[PDB]
Structure formats: C-alpha cells, structure tokens
Amino acid sequence: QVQLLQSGAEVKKPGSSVKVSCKASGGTFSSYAISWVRQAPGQGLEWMGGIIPVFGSANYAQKFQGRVTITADEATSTTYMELSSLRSEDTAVYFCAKGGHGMDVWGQGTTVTVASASTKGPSVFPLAPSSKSTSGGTAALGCLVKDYFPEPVTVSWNSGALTSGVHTFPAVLQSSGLYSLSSVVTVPSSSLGTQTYICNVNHKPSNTKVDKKVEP
C-alpha cells in the first residue's frame, strides 16, 4: 500500500553534510507524520526528529539541534533529512517512518558511513586448516577478508554449494578506517584431501569479486 522510499547509501567524509529523501507512494501525505530515526551498528533506534506537512514546521531532539534539518515537499509527497557537521558516530542506517501515536510504516532505511577513508576492495587470506584447526573428526578452514570500505561484503563458498557449518562473522570497524571480517567453515577432517575449498568474497561498492582457496 503506502510505501516509503528512501535515498541511496552515502559515504560522506568526516565533515561533509548530507540530505536524504524518503518518497511516500501510497495514499495521502499532508497528514502522515514523518519521523526520522537512525540506528548505529547494533544500537537502539534514535529519533532524530519529525514533522507534519500541513503544519510545515518540525522539531528535532536536543543533541541533534542546530546540525539537523528535516523538511517535506508535499508537492512531491517527500521528506528530506539534512545532517551537517558530520562526524564518525553519525554513521548508521537512517530510517524515516510515518504514522498517519504509533508509527505504522517505515522505510527500507539508508546507510550513511562517515569516515576519513576512501573506498577499497578487500584483500583475502586463506585461514588454512592444520593441526591447530581440528578436534575429533572435524577440521575447520575459513577465509579472512581484510581492509575494505565501506560496508558490505558478501561471502559464498564453493559458489553457493557449501551451506552447512559456515559462520560469516559480522564486520569489524578498524582504527585504520576500513572494516574486516572472516568466514570459517567447520567441515570433515577427512574431506580435506578429497574436496575443493574456495570462498567467494565480493565487494560491489568497489566492483570486486576476489576468489581464493584455503588449503593445508
């Protein structure tokens, strides 16, 4: 029915600014009370501020005052979130909800990473399976992806084939600026000299699809 359409993922430098859309294609607009909530990595939602067209004016939450500015151009049934003086903790998934309280429908979100680092495909290193990588009849290899920016990066093994016992860890933010993760797959000891083990990392923010092969 009514749908919220947000803008594309943004990688702004630690100091730039940013405006975000959030088109609303359902029924009315005028009354639908738009609201903007952001959510850092594994953090609670955080209401940045909302507004109401027919009333034009909006209010923003304290810490976000002076550096934030959310508008709405009903003539387009859209809302705009303006966030200036950017820092590194402003990085997160920005949502814009509606409630025409309660707050019914939401958007798909928006990924705005802020950090003084430039885009970069990741390296890739074989977490090779040896003595210190087994127990019982189970050995476990894995792939260490490293130094990329920004999020995210997918990882499929044997091009989709391998499915069981594969833990693709969450990304990790580094002092450096770039993230890094890895994916171990605990398989059968025996199945080492017999089967092939190749991970499929891929980072589209920088058009890349590296492929490695873990071995003893």
Add this chain to the structure above:
Amino acid sequence: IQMTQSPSLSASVGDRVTITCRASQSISSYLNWYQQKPGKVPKLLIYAASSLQSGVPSRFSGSGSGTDFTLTISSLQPEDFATYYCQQSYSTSHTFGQGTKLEIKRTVAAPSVFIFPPSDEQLKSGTASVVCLLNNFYPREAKVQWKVDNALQSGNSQESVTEQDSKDSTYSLSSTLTLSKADYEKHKVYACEVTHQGLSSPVTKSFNRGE
C-alpha cells in the same frame, strides 16, 4: 524525556515474559512498542500503551500507565526472539528505550577453539593477523585472553560474534590479533587462553611462529 529498559534477557520456548520499560517523567499512555529482528525493519507491535497493531498474535499484550509500562508475552515462540524497543510518543521529541534482545536459552556448550596462524600473502603484504576462533558455544559471554611471549595483550586484538543460530542456538566468536610484520617476527609463542561458562579450566591454543 528518557526511557529506561535493561539490554538482554534469555528465555526458553513457551516461557512467559514481561519486558518492563519505565519512564523518567510521566507520559500517560503515549508509549509504543516495536519489534525488530536483524537486517530487517522495525514492525510496530503495540501503541496506545495497550493496543495491538494489526496482525499481532494474541500472545502479545501491552499494559500500564503513568510512567511505567509492560510488554507481556503469553507463551513464547521461535519468532518472538527479536529485539523489542519501547518508545515515548508523548513529548515533542519521541524517545526510545535502549532495547531488549530476547535470545533463546538452552544448555551449556563449551566452545571448541581454533588458532589459525597468519597466512603468507598477508605477512608479505606488510602485516599479520592471528585468528583464534571459537565454534558453537552457549551462553554468549566467552572471554578470550591474548598472550604473546607470555605477555598479556590488550588493544591489538579485535573480536566478533555471529548472531545466534536458529537450529541449535549456539554462538561462534572470533578474536583476530593483528600486528606489523616486524612486530610479529619479533616474538615466539602465540596463544589465546579462553575462559568460559562451560570450561572448568581455560583452554589454550597456540603456535610458535616460524614453524
């Protein structure tokens, strides 16, 4: 203005619960509840302090006034293990509570350690990460000490944790200790002792570089 919620809670399937969200100043009945699971968007559960959104199972029920409120669920299901956030929708500035992740309780599972010494392409690239993995354990609070040449580390090691698994509901952690080529080549042993709610004795995994 604020809103107070504790962080976690671990329950079983069927168990009954109540997530309490208290408020600083009084809000009456302008508190709302939302349910959100990972990589997904918030789905409104309750609003009006006690009024079930459309499509919400009867196990869900809101209750409470003034400054303190309650999300109570009836019997518990695979699906209800999400993160519930309360939100004050009374003032000018809606406020959220920090959120309560309900995770599935189950029986202890001591982790099985793994210590992947550095690759080669990395070492030649200029640095060296040392991966100490922990596969399928529960609960989620497993501690990992990093030791180098018998010295206690801190700052150079980064950890990460897989989101709880639907099938066996376990956890898998992964500490990754990164150093600089030189730095790395100038030390012998490399172990990571793990103390865990499941191990009466901290397990140690290591390897003497250059071997």
